[PDB]
Amino acid sequence: VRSLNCTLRDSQQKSLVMSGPYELKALHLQGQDMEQQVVFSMSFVQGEESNDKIPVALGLKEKNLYLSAVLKDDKPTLQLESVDPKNYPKKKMEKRFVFNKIEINNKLEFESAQFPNWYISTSQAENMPVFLGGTKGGQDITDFTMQFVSS
């Protein structure tokens, strides 16, 4: 399946890092300290495609860990999910693992295919978790830049 290596940064130049085994945190990084930032493998999976909307999966580079969208207390929730490392990645990923990547003026948004109008969001503050957020509108950050890495 076609994959790209990549880092994400939020519109405020917060970089993404592993908090626990299973959380991402967003934080202002610079210097050699930038080593500490998470590389994704972004996969081009089967789904609903327009010029503006591309379905992707987001895995970590050489881990069998994928971002999925899951119901946790009657709320859409973002987790890191362990997968069978022999079976993944796929062209037909399961719907929880699928994001619609939206280009909206040199910025990206990641909408969950599974919960419409839920987006990968970060906090305004340091050192808080990446979450699934349902409100675009000037409080949590929903847009990102993407950098390619020479993988």
From Swiss-Prot:
<dbReference type="GO" id="GO:0005149">
    <property type="term" value="F:interleukin-1 receptor binding"/>
</dbReference>
<dbReference type="GO" id="GO:1903140">
    <property type="term" value="P:regulation of establishment of endothelial barrier"/>
</dbReference>
<comment type="function">
    <text>Potent pro-inflammatory cytokine. Initially discovered as the major endogenous pyrogen, induces prostaglandin synthesis, neutrophil influx and activation, T-cell activation and cytokine production, B-cell activation and antibody production, and fibroblast proliferation and collagen production. Promotes Th17 differentiation of T-cells. Synergizes with IL12/interleukin-12 to induce IFNG synthesis from T-helper 1 (Th1) cells. Plays a role in angiogenesis by inducing VEGF production synergistically with TNF and IL6.</text>
</comment>
<dbReference type="GO" id="GO:0032729">
    <property type="term" value="P:positive regulation of type II interferon production"/>
</dbReference>
<dbReference type="GO" id="GO:0010575">
    <property type="term" value="P:positive regulation of vascular endothelial growth factor production"/>
</dbReference>
<dbReference type="GO" id="GO:0034116">
    <property type="term" value="P:positive regulation of heterotypic cell-cell adhesion"/>
</dbReference>
<dbReference type="GO" id="GO:0014805">
    <property type="term" value="P:smooth muscle adaptation"/>
</dbReference>
<dbReference type="GO" id="GO:0010573">
    <property type="term" value="P:vascular endothelial growth factor production"/>
</dbReference>
<dbReference type="GO" id="GO:0150078">
    <property type="term" value="P:positive regulation of neuroinflammatory response"/>
</dbReference>
<dbReference type="GO" id="GO:0097398">
    <property type="term" value="P:cellular response to interleukin-17"/>
</dbReference>
<dbReference type="GO" id="GO:0019221">
    <property type="term" value="P:cytokine-mediated signaling pathway"/>
</dbReference>
<keyword id="KW-0963">Cytoplasm</keyword>
<protein>
    <recommendedName>
        <fullName>Interleukin-1 beta</fullName>
    </recommendedName>
</protein>
<dbReference type="GO" id="GO:0032757">
    <property type="term" value="P:positive regulation of interleukin-8 production"/>
</dbReference>
<dbReference type="GO" id="GO:0050999">
    <property type="term" value="P:regulation of nitric-oxide synthase activity"/>
</dbReference>
<dbReference type="GO" id="GO:0042102">
    <property type="term" value="P:positive regulation of T cell proliferation"/>
</dbReference>
<dbReference type="GO" id="GO:0005576">
    <property type="term" value="C:extracellular region"/>
</dbReference>
<dbReference type="GO" id="GO:0030593">
    <property type="term" value="P:neutrophil chemotaxis"/>
</dbReference>
<feature type="short sequence motif" description="Involved in interaction with TMED10 C-terminus">
    <location>
        <begin position="110"/>
        <end position="123"/>
    </location>
</feature>
<dbReference type="GO" id="GO:0030949">
    <property type="term" value="P:positive regulation of vascular endothelial growth factor receptor signaling pathway"/>
</dbReference>
<dbReference type="GO" id="GO:0032755">
    <property type="term" value="P:positive regulation of interleukin-6 production"/>
</dbReference>
<dbReference type="GO" id="GO:1902680">
    <property type="term" value="P:positive regulation of RNA biosynthetic process"/>
</dbReference>
<dbReference type="GO" id="GO:0031394">
    <property type="term" value="P:positive regulation of prostaglandin biosynthetic process"/>
</dbReference>
<dbReference type="GO" id="GO:0046827">
    <property type="term" value="P:positive regulation of protein export from nucleus"/>
</dbReference>
<keyword id="KW-0395">Inflammatory response</keyword>
<dbReference type="GO" id="GO:0019904">
    <property type="term" value="F:protein domain specific binding"/>
</dbReference>
<dbReference type="GO" id="GO:0010744">
    <property type="term" value="P:positive regulation of macrophage derived foam cell differentiation"/>
</dbReference>
<dbReference type="GO" id="GO:2000556">
    <property type="term" value="P:positive regulation of T-helper 1 cell cytokine production"/>
</dbReference>
<dbReference type="GO" id="GO:0050767">
    <property type="term" value="P:regulation of neurogenesis"/>
</dbReference>
<dbReference type="GO" id="GO:0032496">
    <property type="term" value="P:response to lipopolysaccharide"/>
</dbReference>
<dbReference type="GO" id="GO:0051897">
    <property type="term" value="P:positive regulation of phosphatidylinositol 3-kinase/protein kinase B signal transduction"/>
</dbReference>
<feature type="site" description="Important for interaction with integrin">
    <location>
        <position position="63"/>
    </location>
</feature>
<dbReference type="GO" id="GO:0051781">
    <property type="term" value="P:positive regulation of cell division"/>
</dbReference>
<dbReference type="GO" id="GO:0070498">
    <property type="term" value="P:interleukin-1-mediated signaling pathway"/>
</dbReference>
<dbReference type="GO" id="GO:0033092">
    <property type="term" value="P:positive regulation of immature T cell proliferation in thymus"/>
</dbReference>
<dbReference type="GO" id="GO:0043409">
    <property type="term" value="P:negative regulation of MAPK cascade"/>
</dbReference>
<dbReference type="GO" id="GO:0005178">
    <property type="term" value="F:integrin binding"/>
</dbReference>
<dbReference type="GO" id="GO:0070555">
    <property type="term" value="P:response to interleukin-1"/>
</dbReference>
<dbReference type="GO" id="GO:0006955">
    <property type="term" value="P:immune response"/>
</dbReference>
<dbReference type="GO" id="GO:0070164">
    <property type="term" value="P:negative regulation of adiponectin secretion"/>
</dbReference>
<keyword id="KW-0666">Pyrogen</keyword>
<dbReference type="GO" id="GO:0046330">
    <property type="term" value="P:positive regulation of JNK cascade"/>
</dbReference>
